[PDB]
């Protein structure tokens, strides 16, 4: 529940003029800018690199859910969503009564001579993409750029800017209306589910109710996600589903975004605008794509491996693309799983062979999708579009448990055990592969103990001098 008190902003567009709903909205520039700037990452100090394997594995398993890097498509989707929300409200001006009547009035005023100039001046969407591409998370982050509920004191309008409905696994069209009321309740503090969402009602009545409630709480955008989950058998076949969605758009009267997979596009082939959420491309315009390189370089810094390689090889990045094929779940999944297996086996360095072992063993269920993308054949890609890696969370727990069962110790882990203060161990890990640990650690401890006041930044050159003299 996100409520805010409305502040009306002077726009530069005549259609938006004196429209409280658009004026209360954040500026289009902000929503476009915030799409580029609003990223989430992890707080990794060098101390976290020194910690135990269980602790570091727990931290690694959080990259899947606490790391977000914006890309080019995110800005495009943000502008599209903002244009939808503002455009959906251009017709709904409470004071601008009639659109056609103003045309006649202006034509009359021109014919009389009151006006010396006048201009006779004179929608849903479908986000289709493979699973793991990043549709749902991108939607969540883009919607965080807006206030979900904006209250206007000048009236009693409780504006609900955005509402997202996810679809149940093996779901039905019946459940979408009920979940609409549920989501509005959870995002507004109301209890429409108890009253309107009752089994006695039919879909038609619930559709009208959805329309009325969305017009009372003027709905900028309605998001229905994971429509791939909707069961064709229960929903009544591809056409029926299609018909429902079409009708649902006209009744509610708000812009509607449907998010699904290329297989769910088979439902809509009898007809909505379609924007595609394609996987990351390594070669763009006959040239290496810098977005892929930037994303992999940023993700590389979330690497809690002691014998790690700080610089990303072209080899490792390109095998990463080969296995992942640009779908962003399998990118992050491959990174995390490779780090876990490295923790398990020692050899805490990511190689192409380690990535290949992870791909061969832990990512078998999504292979038919990936190879389909490798083939470029649209039918195969559509067929395997819904494929995901089941029970990945339990598997991450299992691999972390395997790490915990390890009674062995790496040489670097031993050396960190011998040294005591974090700064000492930081100096070690910084220089541990350019010098032999056996002669490295004693000099570090001697220098640190003999200069308690001296800063670690000042102590590093001293240890360097002693090492080379």
Ligand X SMILES: Nc1ncnc2c1ncn2[C@@H]1O[C@H](COP(=O)(O)OP(=O)(O)O)[C@@H](O)[C@H]1O
Residues that bind ligand X (CB under 6 A): 64, 67-69, 71, 129, 131-138, 328-329, 332
Stretch that binds Mg ion, among 131-139, 190-198, 274-282, 443-451 (CB under 5 A): 131-139
Q: Restricting to residues 139-158, which ones interact with Mg ion according to CB under 5 A? A: none
Measured from the CB atom, is 113 or 353 closer to its own copies?
Answer: 113
Has 167 been labeled as part of a binding site? no
439 is in the binding site of which of ligand X, its own copies, Mg ion, none (Cβ under 5 to 8 A by kind)?
none
Q: State yes or no: 136 annotated in a binding site.
A: yes
Is the distance from CB of 423 to CB of 448 less than 8 angstroms?
A: yes
- Per-residue buried b or exposed e for 275-286, using 16+ beta carbons within 10 Å of the residue's own CB: eebebbebeeee
How far is the C-alpha of 359 from the C-alpha of 367, rounded, in Å? Answer: 9
Closest listed residue to residue 92, CA positions, set 273, 258, 252, 272: 252
CB distance 344 to 399 below 8 Å: yes
Question: With binding defined as CB under 5 A, does residue 69 bind Mg ion?
Answer: no
Taking the CB of residue 102, how many other CB atoms lie within 10 A of it?
A: 12
Task: Check whether 133 is labelled as a binding-site residue.
Answer: yes
The 3-state DSSP class for residue 289 equals coil
**In the complex, least distance from residue 330 CB atom to ligand X, rounded to whole angstroms:** 9
Q: Write each residue from 1 to 30 as x if it is in contact with Mg ion (CB under 5 A), else as -, in one continuous string.
A: ------------------------------
Out of 41, 96, 105, 136, name the contact with Mg ion by CB under 5 A: 136
Q: Among residues 38 and 251, whose Cβ is nearest to its own copies?
A: 38
Smaller CB distance to ligand X: residue 226 or 348?
A: 226
Q: Which tokens in the block code for residue 212? A: 């009325």
Task: Spell out the residues 6+ positions from residue 247 whose beta carbon is closer than 8 angstroms to its own.
Answer: 207
Nearer to ligand X, 213 or 327 (CB): 327
Mark 299-338 with x for binding to Mg ion (rule: CB under 5 A) and - for no binding: ----------------------------------------
Q: How many CB atoms are located within 10 Å of the residue 76 CB?
A: 13
User: Taking the complex as a whole, how short is the minimal distance between the CB of residue 41 and ligand X, in angstroms?
Assistant: 9
Closest CA to 276 of 85, 124, 69, 126: 126
Pick what 236 binds: its own copies, ligand X, Mg ion, none; C-beta below 5 to 8 Å, kind-dependent. none
Q: Which does 329 bind (CB under 5 to 8 A by kind): ligand X, its own copies, Mg ion, none?
A: ligand X
Measure the CA–CA gap between 180 and 158, rounded to whole angstroms. Answer: 16
The nearer residue to ligand X, 79 or 185, going by C-beta atoms, is: 79
Q: How many angstroms from the chain centroid is the CA of residue 442? A: 47
**Min CB(147)–Mg ion separation in Å:** 23
59 assigned to a ligand binding site: no
Contacts of 282 (CB under 8 A, 6+ apart): 288, 289, 292, 318, 321, 326
- Phi then psi for residue 288, to 5 deg, are -60, 135
Tell me the closest approach of the beta carbon of residue 120 to its own copies, in angstroms: 5
Between 166 and 402, name the residue whose CB sits nearer to ligand X. 166
- Closest CB 30 distance from its own copies, rounded Å: 5
User: 230 — phi, psi (to 5°)?
Assistant: -60, 130
DSSP secondary structure letter of residue 164? E
* Residue 52 near residue 31 (C-beta atoms within 8 A): no
306 neighbors 413 (Cβ within 8 angstroms) = yes
CB of 291 to its own copies, least distance (A): 7
Task: Choose between 152 and 174: whose C-beta lies nearer to its own copies.
Answer: 152
137 contact choice in Mg ion, its own copies, ligand X, none (CB below 5 to 8 Å, kind-dependent): ligand X
Tell me whether residue 134 is annotated as binding: yes
Between CA 423 and CA 11 the distance in angstroms is 54
Quote the CA–CA distance of 282 and 279 in Å, as a whole number.
10
| Angle, helices 456-467/422-431, rounded to nearest 10 degrees | 50
State the nearest-atom distance from the C-beta of 42 to its own copies, in Å: 7
Q: Is 130 annotated as a binding residue?
A: yes
Of residues 329 and 412, the one with the C-beta less far from ligand X:
329
**Which of the 8 DSSP states describes residue 10?**
-
Instruction: Name the residue nearer to its own copies (CB basis): 187 or 370.
Output: 187
Nearest residue to ligand X on Cβ basis: 134
Q: If you search the block for the tokens 């995110």, which residue do you land on?
A: 74
Is residue 372 within 8 A of residue 262, CB to CB? The reply is no
User: Least distance from C-beta 67 to ligand X, angstroms?
Assistant: 5
Selection from 232, 194, 188 nearest residue 4 by Cα: 188
Question: How much is the CA Rg of the chain, to the nearest whole Å?
Answer: 28
* Residue 129 touches which member of Mg ion, ligand X, its own copies, none, C-beta under 5-8 Å by kind: ligand X
Interface with Mg ion in residues 429-448 (CB under 5 A): none
Q: How far is the CB of 261 from ligand X (least distance, A)?
A: 8
Binding site membership: which residues?
129-136
- Residues forming contacts to Mg ion in the complex (CB under 5 A) are 135-136
Binding site membership for ATP: which residues?
129-136
């Amino acid at each position: 529940a996100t409520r805010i008190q409305a502040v009306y902003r002077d726009t530069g567009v005549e259609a938006y003029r004196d429209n409280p709903f658009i004026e209360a909205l954040p500026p289009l520039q902000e929503s476009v800018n915030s799409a580029a700037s609003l990223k989430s990452s992890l707080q990794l100090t060098s101390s976290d690199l020194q910690k135990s394997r269980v602790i570091r594995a727990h931290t690694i398993c959080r990259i899947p859910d606490d790391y977000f890097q914006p890309l080019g498509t995110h800005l495009l989707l943000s502008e599209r969503i903002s244009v939808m929300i503002r455009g959906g409200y251009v017709g709904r001006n409470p004071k601008t009564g009639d659109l056609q009547k103003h045309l006649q009035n202006g034509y009359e005023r021109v014919q009389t001579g009151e006006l010396e100039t006048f201009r006779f001046e004179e929608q849903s969407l479908l986000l289709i993409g493979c699973s793991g591409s990043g549709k749902t998370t991108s939607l969540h982050r883009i919607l965080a750029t807006y206030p979900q509920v904006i209250y206007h004191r000048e009236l009693n309008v409780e504006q609900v800017v955005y509402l997202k409905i996810d679809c149940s696994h093996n779901g039905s069209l019946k459940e979408i209306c009920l979940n609409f009321f549920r989501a509005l309740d959870r995002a507004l503090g109301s209890n429409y589910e108890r009253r309107y969402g009752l089994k006695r009602h039919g879909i038609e009545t619930m559709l009208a109710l959805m329309s009325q409630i969305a017009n009372a709480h003027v709905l900028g955008l309605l998001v229905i996600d994971e429509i791939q989950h909707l069961s064709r058998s229960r929903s009544g076949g591809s056409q029926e589903m299609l018909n429902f969605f079409v009708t649902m758009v006209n009744i509610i009267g708000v812009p509607v975004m449907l998010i699904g997979t290329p297989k769910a596009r088979e439902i809509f082939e009898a007809d909505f605008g379609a924007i595609f959420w394609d996987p990351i491309q390594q070669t763009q315009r006959g040239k290496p794509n810098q977005e892929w390189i930037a994303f992999t370089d940023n993700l590389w810094q979330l690497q809690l491996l002691q014998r790690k390689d700080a610089l990303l090889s072209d080899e490792v990045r390109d095998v990463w693309y080969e296995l992942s094929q640009g779908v962003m779940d399998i990118v992050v999944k491959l990174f995390v799983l490779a780090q876990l297996r490295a923790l398990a086996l020692g050899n805490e360095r990511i190689t192409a062979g380690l990535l290949r072992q992870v791909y061969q063993d832990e990512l078998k269920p999504v292979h038919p999708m990936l190879e389909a993308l490798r083939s470029g054949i649209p039918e195969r890609i559509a067929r395997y579009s819904d494929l995901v890696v089941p029970e990945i969370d339990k598997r991450l727990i299992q691999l972390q448990l395997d790490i915990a069962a390890i009674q062995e110790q790496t040489p670097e882990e031993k050396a960190l055990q011998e040294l005591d203060t974090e700064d000492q161990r930081h100096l070690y890990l910084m220089l541990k592969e350019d010098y032999d640990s056996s002669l490295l650690i004693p000099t570090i401890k001697k220098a640190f103990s003999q200069n308690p006041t001296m800063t670690r930044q000042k102590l590093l050159p001293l240890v360097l001098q002693w090492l080379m003299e």
